[PDB]
Each structure stands twice: as C-alpha cells, then as structure tokens.
From a paper:
We determined the near-atomic resolution structures of Csm proteins complexed with a 40 nt [name] (from [name]), with or without 49 nt target [name]-bound, using cryo-EM single particle analysis. The apo and target [name]-bound states also correspond to [name] inactive and activated states of the complex, respectively. In our structure, an endogenous ATP molecule was observed in both the apo and target [name]-bound states, within the [name]-formed binding pocket. The pentose moiety and phosphoryl atoms of the ATP molecule are in close proximity to residues His303, Lys635, Asp575/576, and Leu521 of [name]. The structural comparison between the apo and target [name]-bound states of the Csm complex revealed no substantial structural difference between the two structures.
In a [name]-Cas system, Cas proteins form a complex with a small [name] RNA ([name]) to detect and cleave invading nucleic acid (DNA or RNA) that has a complementary sequence to the [name]. The Csm complex, with the RNA cleavage site located in [name] subunits, targets and cleaves [name] at 6-nucleotide intervals. The results showed that the Csm complex displays a spiral-like architecture, with two spirally stacked density columns, including a single [name], a single [name], and multiple copies of [name] and [name].
Numbering used by the authors: 3 to 297
Amino acid sequence: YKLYIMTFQNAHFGSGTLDSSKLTFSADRIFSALVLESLKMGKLDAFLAEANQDKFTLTDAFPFQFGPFLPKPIGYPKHDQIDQSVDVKEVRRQAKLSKKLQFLALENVDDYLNGELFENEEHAVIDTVTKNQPHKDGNLYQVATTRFSNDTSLYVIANESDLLNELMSSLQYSGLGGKRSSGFGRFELDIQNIPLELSDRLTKNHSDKVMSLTTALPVDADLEEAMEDGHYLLTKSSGFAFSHATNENYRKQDLYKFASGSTFSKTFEGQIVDVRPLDFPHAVLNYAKPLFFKL
RNA sequence: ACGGAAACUUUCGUAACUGUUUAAUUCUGUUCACUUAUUC
C-alpha cells in the first residue's frame, strides 16, 4: 500500500545471541519498537486501538537495490524443472545455490517458478568489532555489525494515516535494534507516495496459492486446517524483557513462528499474542500479522 | 513496551649506545725605473 524506504549503515541485528548478527531481522522488532517509544511521547493508548484494526499491518525488512526485493518461495519449484540437463554433478551443485539465496528481485517472481537458478547478489559483508573494559579484570566481548554497500537499502510497507507518519519520524534518530546505546540503528526515512504497479498483489480475502510472510502464526481455530500440504520453516525469536518496573526483567516465553516467504494454501486470520510470564503492570504485545502475495 | 539493557583494546615505554670529511699539497717559473744627455 505504502512503502517506507530506509537505508542502514553500520547497524546490528542479533538472532539468538548478542555476539551473532544477521543481515536482516524479524518483523517483531519493528512492532515492539514503536509501542515502546509511544509511552515516552504521550500516546500509548492511541496506538493500542490502532494495531488491532485488521487493516493495519507491517512488513519485514526487504532489501532495496534499484528495485524492491522479495523472499524466495519455500519449496518452489517442485521436482519438474531441471534447468539444462547436462550431468548429475552440475545439477546437484546448482540446487544449493537457490537454498542459500535470501531474496529475489521484483521481476524474477514469475521466472523463478518456470525454471531459473542463479546466485544471490552480494548485498553486504558481515564485519565484527571488538570492545573491552580496563577497570574490570580486563574482560572483553565480541559483537558483529552490518555494513551495507553497493547502495543497499530497506523498505517497510504499512498503512497511510495521520498518526503513523509521526511515530516513525523519531525512530530514525533513536536507534533500531542491536546496541542502541552507541549509534547502531540511526537511519534516514525516505518518504514516498506511489509504490510500484507490480507490487500490488497484497490480498487477505481469496486463497489462490498464497504465501505468508513476516513470520506467520495461525489461530487456535485454524491450525491444522491450513497446515496440511504446505511449506514452512520453524525459526526462533525470544530474549529478556525490557520494562521499567520489575526489578528483575523476566524472560519472555518462546514463540517459535515461521519464516518470511512460507507457502501454505488457505488464508489465515492473524492475532496478537500476549506474553505474560509472571506478572507485569503492562502487556508485552506482539505483531503476528502475516500478509499474503498472489505470486 | 527492541537476543535487549550496563562496558576506553585501556593502564606501562627517547628507534637508543658508539664515531674529527679526514690523510697528502710553496700562487710560483722568466724580469736593471730604463734609453739619448758639457751646470756651462
């Protein structure tokens, strides 16, 4: 509906452990950031009645290098396309190149299903930095960073309103993920109006071989009915909570969701799960609002 | 209500000791203040 192009430079997005880092990040990082900063501004109760309005949703961090990128379809293609049958060694060595691929181009969303295999474009390299502490037994730690290159940018698709544009205006000067108390999260928001005439297949009604993204999460009333005959991949996303009145900061429960680009068969619903381990004066919200692409 | 929050590759240390641009070498070899001339 409306994409928000933003580029990163020397950022950090861990996945499992603080020392490790990935080029992208899950969709729950953006939703858990605007709600945390809404209380500091003075409108936490205003955004609570907006996220639960069905039409309001968010997208994952997709690369943008002279064109929007989309994840590869999980399980596609099937066992029918061999792509130039020459030898069993040449066909087997090129099948892994598509497995290590991260995102596909906007113009290759239709040619990949017909029979085409190629190596993903080199977006950025994983670089790490070292730190220590002199007045504490000389201890040290290692953390990784993400330095984009070759004009590597990202974009998130949301809904146009007169309240969301002001909440994200301060996020570019406040950090986003990783070591926020250093400067690993500052970016620049490039606002736009017209997205693209091809990337308008986002629907949530009919079910014609759709594809769920942004880590799907089925509802209790529709789990196995949409899980049978599908392609998915279980991941992992958790960590310690961040509150201001606990004196302990309890651990959030595990929420093994899916991956960006899973192909099911029917249309889900999307709910908001509440993470309450012991007791908290507030409520740890979560995204869990997957979209669908016509493919 | 962000696998996050708290954190100096920091504290220490002359690129240093030693060693003549030195030894050898005449600004000298040839050269009339000269030629003509009554203090008558």
